Design an enzyme around this catalytic site. Sequence first.
Site, PDB file in Angstrom:
ATOM      1  N   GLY A  19       0.846  -1.186   0.000  1.00 28.84           N
ATOM      2  CA  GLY A  19       0.000   0.000   0.000  1.00 28.84           C
ATOM      3  C   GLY A  19       0.881   1.235   0.000  1.00 28.84           C
ATOM      4  O   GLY A  19       2.011   1.193  -0.494  1.00 28.84           O
ATOM      5  N   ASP A 130       1.546  -3.748  15.053  1.00 29.47           N
ATOM      6  CA  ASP A 130       2.318  -3.954  13.835  1.00 29.47           C
ATOM      7  C   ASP A 130       3.835  -3.800  14.130  1.00 29.47           C
ATOM      8  O   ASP A 130       4.559  -3.017  13.517  1.00 29.47           O
ATOM      9  CB  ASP A 130       1.839  -2.974  12.769  1.00 29.47           C
ATOM     10  CG  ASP A 130       2.222  -3.397  11.347  1.00 29.47           C
ATOM     11  OD1 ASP A 130       1.931  -2.615  10.402  1.00 29.47           O
ATOM     12  OD2 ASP A 130       2.796  -4.495  11.162  1.00 29.47           O
ATOM     13  N   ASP A 157      -9.659   0.207  11.163  1.00 24.50           N
ATOM     14  CA  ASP A 157     -10.825  -0.403  10.478  1.00 24.50           C
ATOM     15  C   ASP A 157     -10.803  -0.217   8.962  1.00 24.50           C
ATOM     16  O   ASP A 157     -11.068  -1.147   8.213  1.00 24.50           O
ATOM     17  CB  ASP A 157     -12.157   0.163  11.005  1.00 24.50           C
ATOM     18  CG  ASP A 157     -12.400  -0.150  12.480  1.00 24.50           C
ATOM     19  OD1 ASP A 157     -11.787  -1.097  13.040  1.00 24.50           O
ATOM     20  OD2 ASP A 157     -13.216   0.573  13.085  1.00 24.50           O
TER      21      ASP A 157
HETATM   22  N1  LIG Z   1       9.817   8.324   9.380  1.00 27.94           N
HETATM   23  C1  LIG Z   1      10.547   7.661   8.478  1.00 27.94           C
HETATM   24  N2  LIG Z   1      11.836   8.009   8.241  1.00 27.94           N
HETATM   25  C2  LIG Z   1      12.563   7.324   7.333  1.00 27.94           C
HETATM   26  N3  LIG Z   1      12.068   6.279   6.630  1.00 27.94           N
HETATM   27  C3  LIG Z   1      10.780   5.829   6.785  1.00 27.94           C
HETATM   28  C4  LIG Z   1       9.928   6.511   7.757  1.00 27.94           C
HETATM   29  N4  LIG Z   1       8.732   5.883   7.722  1.00 27.94           N
HETATM   30  C5  LIG Z   1       8.798   4.891   6.810  1.00 27.94           C
HETATM   31  N5  LIG Z   1      10.018   4.858   6.268  1.00 27.94           N
HETATM   32  C6  LIG Z   1      10.467   3.918   5.249  1.00 27.94           C
HETATM   33  O1  LIG Z   1       9.366   3.671   4.414  1.00 27.94           O
HETATM   34  C7  LIG Z   1       9.268   2.278   4.152  1.00 27.94           C
HETATM   35  C8  LIG Z   1       7.816   1.927   3.822  1.00 27.94           C
HETATM   36  O2  LIG Z   1       7.061   2.118   5.001  1.00 27.94           O
HETATM   37  P1  LIG Z   1       5.557   1.599   5.188  1.00 27.94           P
HETATM   38  O3  LIG Z   1       5.263   1.878   6.653  1.00 27.94           O
HETATM   39  O4  LIG Z   1       4.684   2.249   4.146  1.00 27.94           O
HETATM   40  O5  LIG Z   1       5.622   0.011   4.926  1.00 27.94           O
HETATM   41  P2  LIG Z   1       6.595  -1.003   5.720  1.00 27.94           P
HETATM   42  O6  LIG Z   1       6.331  -0.833   7.190  1.00 27.94           O
HETATM   43  O7  LIG Z   1       7.975  -0.968   5.124  1.00 27.94           O
HETATM   44  O8  LIG Z   1       6.058  -2.418   5.242  1.00 27.94           O
HETATM   45  P3  LIG Z   1       4.502  -2.757   5.473  1.00 27.94           P
HETATM   46  O9  LIG Z   1       3.806  -2.352   4.184  1.00 27.94           O
HETATM   47  O10 LIG Z   1       4.516  -4.257   5.656  1.00 27.94           O
HETATM   48  O11 LIG Z   1       4.167  -1.925   6.719  1.00 27.94           O
HETATM   49  C9  LIG Z   1       9.833   1.610   5.388  1.00 27.94           C
HETATM   50  O12 LIG Z   1      10.385   0.326   5.074  1.00 27.94           O
HETATM   51  C10 LIG Z   1      10.902   2.587   5.825  1.00 27.94           C
HETATM   52  O13 LIG Z   1      12.158   2.238   5.232  1.00 27.94           O
HETATM   53  O1  LIG Z   2       1.180   3.476   8.824  1.00 28.98           O
HETATM   54  C1  LIG Z   2       0.497   2.624   9.366  1.00 28.98           C
HETATM   55  N1  LIG Z   2       0.545   1.355   9.009  1.00 28.98           N
HETATM   56  O2  LIG Z   2       1.406   0.985   8.021  1.00 28.98           O
HETATM   57  C2  LIG Z   2       0.885   0.303   6.874  1.00 28.98           C
HETATM   58  C3  LIG Z   2       1.762   0.513   5.636  1.00 28.98           C
HETATM   59  O3  LIG Z   2       1.852   1.906   5.229  1.00 28.98           O
HETATM   60  C4  LIG Z   2       1.148  -0.325   4.522  1.00 28.98           C
HETATM   61  O4  LIG Z   2       0.346   0.531   3.701  1.00 28.98           O
HETATM   62  C5  LIG Z   2      -0.454   3.048  10.413  1.00 28.98           C
HETATM   63  O5  LIG Z   2      -1.500   2.273  10.811  1.00 28.98           O
HETATM   64  C6  LIG Z   2      -2.159   3.064  11.788  1.00 28.98           C
HETATM   65  C7  LIG Z   2      -3.296   2.683  12.471  1.00 28.98           C
HETATM   66  C8  LIG Z   2      -3.846   3.571  13.381  1.00 28.98           C
HETATM   67  N2  LIG Z   2      -3.265   4.759  13.589  1.00 28.98           N
HETATM   68  C9  LIG Z   2      -2.160   5.163  12.932  1.00 28.98           C
HETATM   69  C10 LIG Z   2      -1.586   4.312  12.010  1.00 28.98           C
HETATM   70  C11 LIG Z   2      -0.493   4.343  11.133  1.00 28.98           C
HETATM   71  N3  LIG Z   2       0.517   5.252  10.881  1.00 28.98           N
HETATM   72  C12 LIG Z   2       1.367   5.885  11.758  1.00 28.98           C
HETATM   73  C13 LIG Z   2       1.259   5.782  13.146  1.00 28.98           C
HETATM   74  C14 LIG Z   2       2.115   6.469  13.979  1.00 28.98           C
HETATM   75  C15 LIG Z   2       3.098   7.299  13.435  1.00 28.98           C
HETATM   76  I1  LIG Z   2       4.451   8.374  14.630  1.00 28.98           I
HETATM   77  C16 LIG Z   2       3.222   7.412  12.072  1.00 28.98           C
HETATM   78  C17 LIG Z   2       2.369   6.713  11.245  1.00 28.98           C
HETATM   79  F1  LIG Z   2       2.552   6.864   9.929  1.00 28.98           F
END
Ligand SMILES: Nc1ncnc2c1ncn2[C@@H]1O[C@H](COP(=O)(O)OP(=O)(O)OP(=O)(O)O)[C@@H](O)[C@H]1O
Ligand SMILES: O=C(NOC[C@H](O)CO)c1oc2ccncc2c1Nc1ccc(I)cc1F
Length: 289
Positions: A19, A130, A157
């Site tokens: 996603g 997660d 949700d």
């Molecule tokens: N605050 C941040 N600073 C630097 N890199 C970040 C940050 N947040 C996310 N990333 C990078 O973005 C990538 C994609 O994040 P995302 O949360 O969308 O999916 P994910 O956690 O890698 O995998 P999943 O889809 O299974 O959650 C992460 O693997 C990470 O390397």
């Molecule tokens: O990013 C989330 N999941 O990752 C799914 C992947 O992108 C796959 O598509 C996620 O899921 C939630 C559920 C409820 N509240 C917040 C969040 C939230 N983000 C979040 C929470 C805290 C902080 I600091 C930064 C955030 F980006």
Amino acid sequence: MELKDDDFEKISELGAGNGGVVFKVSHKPSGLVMARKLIHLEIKPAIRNQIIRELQVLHECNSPYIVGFYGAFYSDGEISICMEHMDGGSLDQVLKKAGRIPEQILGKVSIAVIKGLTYLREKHKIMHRDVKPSNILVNSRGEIKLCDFGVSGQLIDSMAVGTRSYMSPERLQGTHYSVQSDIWSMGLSLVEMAVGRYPIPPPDAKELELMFPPMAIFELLDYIVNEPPPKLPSGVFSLEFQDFVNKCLIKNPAERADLKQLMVHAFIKRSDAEEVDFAGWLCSTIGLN
Ligand SMILES: Nc1ncnc2c1ncn2[C@@H]1O[C@H](COP(=O)(O)OP(=O)(O)OP(=O)(O)O)[C@@H](O)[C@H]1O
Ligand SMILES: O=C(NOC[C@H](O)CO)c1oc2ccncc2c1Nc1ccc(I)cc1F
Ligand SMILES: [Mg+2]
């Protein structure tokens, strides 16, 4: 200051996952570099305001072990979450480059995760939901922080998988889960990062000598629920670390260790004491500072 879509400018792309993508962006009015996560949700305009309303609690989520929040808004199809850029990335990225993470370093990580979960529970009554290497972020100042935790009930949700699960047997089998499930995920993440690959199925003796096809979806999930849990291999890791993960990976969630017990575990008490230049190691291994 309020955050709005036209105030940003993309610098680079930090990655993606099952996603939405995250960009390293510049907030033009402030000058700040931020990480902007975009999540696509074909979702009615009423409940997308609730999500934003609920995500405002992140402004009060302040902890050295939790990724900082700048703001949230809805753009054009997508809800934007703006956070601290962590210039070291996620622990799943550093694992790719590192091969393995040393035990001493995982001691510092274990500490961070436990203290982050504890912060979220004690001060905000929320579970992560997660926990995995990609949602543990690190930076060149040596900080280790959690992100992508479940603050907004609505957002949870509106999103409700992949080919590798860090879900606990209980969560996999039904609705009967809660905070103990984060312990399992942490435990599995740790075995993963210690050994250098996802620990299910476990490696044979011959694959362990080398270190020291992929499974189908049902096969893997069956292994997690019905087969004995993964273990840190004997010999190359301290007995206290082995116990630590074994306590995290007990199938029965009530029998499994909780945060209070893990906090006073021998492996933490040892890692608290140790002198580790995590900042230095991190940069050295990924090539930054
Ligand atoms: N605050 C941040 N600073 C630097 N890199 C970040 C940050 N947040 C996310 N990333 C990078 O973005 C990538 C994609 O994040 P995302 O949360 O969308 O999916 P994910 O956690 O890698 O995998 P999943 O889809 O299974 O959650 C992460 O693997 C990470 O390397
Ligand atoms: O990013 C989330 N999941 O990752 C799914 C992947 O992108 C796959 O598509 C996620 O899921 C939630 C559920 C409820 N509240 C917040 C969040 C939230 N983000 C979040 C929470 C805290 C902080 I600091 C930064 C955030 F980006
Ligand atoms: Mg993530």
